[PDB]
Design a protein around this ligand. Structure first.
Ligand code: CL
Ligand code: CL
Ligand code: CL
Ligand code: CL
Lengths: 161, 179, 179, 161
């Protein structure tokens, strides 16, 4: 019924958006952590993809999923929408210092390493490019605006289909 | 300026219609390549704005004049406006009153809009779409270091398809007004 | 044609000198943008050559004429020549007598060659290099689907720096003659 | 004295070039296989990089190395040269069917997957782009010419510095 695939730059507030959306529609939030557990029955990746596909296509469940190539995997399911959440450098830096209790220099390095890792993971499995507007239905930069605004824009999008 | 909206777009996406709808909602002018072709056709310039410095490097004069029109209207006259294309999100980088949005669509939706707009068949529609998009990407990536169509180049990107032009316009207005 | 050599290059790399040295070694003409500006300035064309089909899509006439000059000289007149730039490796794709080579250099080497060539300082040299390279990349990637400067676009790429122009030229000749 | 860093598209003949060059100069051929062994004293990657660096910079050894970001790692060692070996699609296909005893369809899929994996590995650790001419001193497409010709062009390059 509603599947929301969330991509995000590290420290942009993408998890907070994902969660707020899941609370709004009262549906589950799936992540890497959950899928890691729930698929011990690159090999890992096939199991996770096939799981997201079960839930989407056959079980017809509603959920939010962060990452996991979900927008590529769920690509012909007419009930899923995707969004990529980004942020201002300074907004992200503060979010990552706070969450991880680290200094500025290290925050910035974590951001760069994590965004490289996401990009690599996504672009290996998908033909589309991580972070490019064509890969998603909506992209929102959090900075000029706050997480709640991003979340509401996404619900508007979804509620108006 | 008080509100400046810089719109980029894929050909056929409905991006002009969104730009128009926004200009009407806020009752401000809509500037385009067409208008700048007119009003921008008549040493101090190193405001360290990348497209201009780049334009100046020895080896279009038109491009500079248009950039400078846009920069003056935004920064010196403090006018509010909508500007489509023309590297405006890059030029007006340092202006904290500027928002930018990239409008895109799915193939079917765009091809339908283009055939209908241009009295053309599917084949042609899709060729036009690819040419104009390459054209805009080339113009943009020549003058800017950021990448045409990349989410990081903009504040908002909205794909028109699952949602219509009115829904995209409303979402841009919400972004703007909640800032 | 019997031998056709299509040369691409970074600005300042020594690529014109290699093209010249090759043309002299094989005693064939050296065609450039300059010459094509002259000799190529005066319906059948869908030889399914990508740059031409792309050029034809409705929305440069010059570009078509130059592509067609190159294509005719290669394929119909069977002439041997060196051609710098002008998308020649793409245009002459199907001609099994064509080799292509991309010439590049390290920064120091290029900046030195450019300052000396253009009576210019370091700062300017490096700005020129970046502008011309963006210019060539844009021209090339607009008309072709392959990527300017990517090794897959060419048969050979040689960085001039650790080795001189004579060494690069010899290596291209070895490639050609051992085929 | 001489360090040769070899990159390559899967099935292009890059290993055969690397080996022939090592025989020519009578120096060792290091690969992933060797480095895998010789560095149990992404964590793995640091150990391998630091090993290549020892051999290069401190021990001053001569060698050929395939892959392993060697051109990036050995970047200010004025005695190393890099080359990227590529191939014609049809030449590569036959080389991979023969070596791996597989059909055409599968050869082509192996090529695509292996080239994606190399690209990802390289582009994660390096700032330069796998396969781009600027990343290397020489790039050669084997197809119009054979492995021995590629190998000789590289020796010319090296011998003329
Ligand atoms: Cl992501
Ligand atoms: Cl645009
Ligand atoms: Cl070129
Ligand atoms: Cl490699």
């Amino acid at each position: 019924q509603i599947i929301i695939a969330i991509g995000r730059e590290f420290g942009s507030g993408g998890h907070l958006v994902a969660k707020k959306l899941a609370e709004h529609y009262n549906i589950p939030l799936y992540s890497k952590e959950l899928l890691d557990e729930v698929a011990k029955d690159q090999d890992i990746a096939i199991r996770q993809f096939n799981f997201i596909r079960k839930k989407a296509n056959e079980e017809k469940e509603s959920f939010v999923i962060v990452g996991r190539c979900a927008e590529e995997i769920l690509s012909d399911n007419p009930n899923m929408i995707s969004a990529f959440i980004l942020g201002d450098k300074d907004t992200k830096t503060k979010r990552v210092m706070e969450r991880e209790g680290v200094d500025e220099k290290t925050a910035l390095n974590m951001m760069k390493k994590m965004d490289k890792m996401r990009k690599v993971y996504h672009n290996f499995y998908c033909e589309s490019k991580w972070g490019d507007s064509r890969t998603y239905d909506i992209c929102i930069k959090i900075g000029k605006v706050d997480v709640d605004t991003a979340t509401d824009m996404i619900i508007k999008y979804i509620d108006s289909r």
